[PDB]
């Protein structure tokens, strides 16, 4: 049981590192999409202006 707890700690650490990388990537993707939409709207408005 003790070894199981230690291994759970370490393996959950590695997995949490991966999961954090993943969530950061998802947020970056959402931000990039928002930026692209804003850039498109800005370009259209700039042409009209």
């Amino acid at each position: 049981m003790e070894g199981k707890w230690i291994t759970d700690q370490l393996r959950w650490k590695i997995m949490s590192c991966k999961m954090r990388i993943e969530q950061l990537k998802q947020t970056i993707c959402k931000g990039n999409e928002e930026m692209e939409k804003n850039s498109e709207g800005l370009l259209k408005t700039k042409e009209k202006n």
Partner: protein, 333 residues
């Protein structure tokens, strides 16, 4: 005069006006009646300290009886809501001596039509609470309640079920058999595609890992745990890493459209034969009700049907057949 009027009038007024149509009024009446029982109790304690206990016993009996009588209201939704909200130590008036005794029957009477399956999860939580001081030996009597909740309608009620699961794992007293039973059952349900259900399952899993813990965890579950853990990398005392170890939950939508069907029961046998093909000797495709079965099978296979699916698919598919018979009977109304 105040000491004398406390119980006499307090119960008198509480009852005389207790009769009211408003279900919310009745639930409030219940919560306030609990408060007023605490009040009369403090009044008796102060009288004892100031100025035998047999009156105290009669009062506590009246308290438990009042809790039950309140449970007699037809607005079962009202009772469920009031209990779930107040907690009130679940009326803390009869305990295992009588709380199990009359409370088991009272909750069982709730086993009517499951329209409010959310109320079903609420009742599961309420049973877990009643497990606090009523289930040492009737814990198995809840195990039949465990199966009944397995018969519950709401998948949100299913998340509430995993919650109350961990809750009993704390409470316990009927675990070992039901313990391994739930371990095996979840093993296929591991990749369960219900984010609420998946997370609450990982949580009940960590709670059980605490409760049974020991090497018992390894042998009993870790084999059942292997059905989901992509890697043995998790703090089983934790649910987030635990799920991280587990494989990604399968598309519940795909089986649901599969679930949406009617004759999948025989299609279920066909899927079992296909699994045997995966691990066995079935090379051929029997002559099922070809159009729908074949269409769905090809759609799923081309969809990316992977190796690990079929087993947990069949397990939760028996669960499905249950829930689907449930839906068909609900169509009666």
């Amino acid at each position: 005069n105040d000491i004398n009027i406390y119980p006499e009038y307090i119960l008198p007024g509480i009852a005389h006006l207790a009769q009211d149509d408003a279900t919310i009024v009745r639930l409030a009446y219940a919560e306030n009646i609990a408060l007023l029982a605490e009040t009369a109790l403090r009044f008796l304690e102060l009288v004892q300290l100031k100025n035998y206990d047999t009156e105290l016993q009669a009062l506590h009996e009246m308290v438990q009886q009042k809790v039950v009588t309140l449970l007699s209201d037809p607005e079962n939704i009202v009772k469920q809501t009031l209990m779930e909200n107040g907690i009130t130590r679940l009326c803390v008036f009869f305990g295992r001596q009588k709380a199990n005794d009359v409370l088991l029957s009272h909750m069982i009477t709730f086993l009517n039509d499951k329209n409010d399956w959310h109320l079903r999860g609420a009742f599961f939580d309420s049973i877990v609470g009643v497990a606090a001081y009523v289930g040492w030996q009737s814990s198995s009597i809840l195990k039949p309640l465990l199966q009944q909740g397995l018969s519950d309608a709401e998948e949100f009620v299913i998340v509430k079920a995993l919650y109350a699961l961990t809750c009993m794992c704390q409470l316990g007293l009927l675990q070992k058999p039901h313990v391994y039973e739930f371990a095996s059952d979840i093993a296929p349900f591991l990749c369960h595609p219900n984010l609420w259900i998946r997370y609450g399952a990982v949580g009940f899993i960590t709670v059980v890992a605490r409760q049974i813990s020991t090497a018992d965890v390894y042998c009993k579950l870790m084999p059942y745990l292997d059905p989901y853990i992509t890697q043995p990398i998790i703090q089983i005392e934790r649910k987030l890493v635990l799920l991280s170890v587990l494989k990604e939950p399968v598309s519940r939508s795909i089986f649901d459209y599969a679930l949406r069907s009617k004759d999948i029961t025989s299609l279920f046998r066909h899927l079992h034969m296909r699994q045997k093909k995966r691990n066995g000797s079935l090379p051929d495709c029997p002559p099922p009700e070809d159009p729908a079965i074949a269409q769905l099978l090809k759609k799923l296979l081309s969809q990316g049907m992977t190796e690990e699916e079929e087993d947990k698919l069949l397990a939760l598919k028996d669960f499905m057949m249950k829930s689907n018979k449930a839906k068909a009977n609900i169509v009666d109304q």
